[PDB]
Design a protein around this ligand. Structure first.
Ligand code: NA
Length: 55
């Protein structure tokens, strides 16, 4: 099974993508991620995506 650096934060309240650093904060605290940010998908719907890799 491929190890993927990024994973959508399941069921995250997208409204929080409006808050600076909030997806990053919640990814790191709630998921032990290295970081997180919100991203627009191909239809421009926002999702909070956690990142488990270092850069
Ligand atoms: Na931010």
């Amino acid at each position: 099974v491929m190890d993927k650096c990024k994973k959508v934060y399941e069921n995250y309240p997208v409204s929080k993508c409006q808050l600076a650093n909030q997806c990053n904060y919640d990814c790191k605290l709630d998921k032990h991620a290295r970081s997180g940010e919100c991203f627009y998908d191909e239809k421009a719907n926002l999702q909070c995506i956690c990142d488990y890799c270092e850069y």
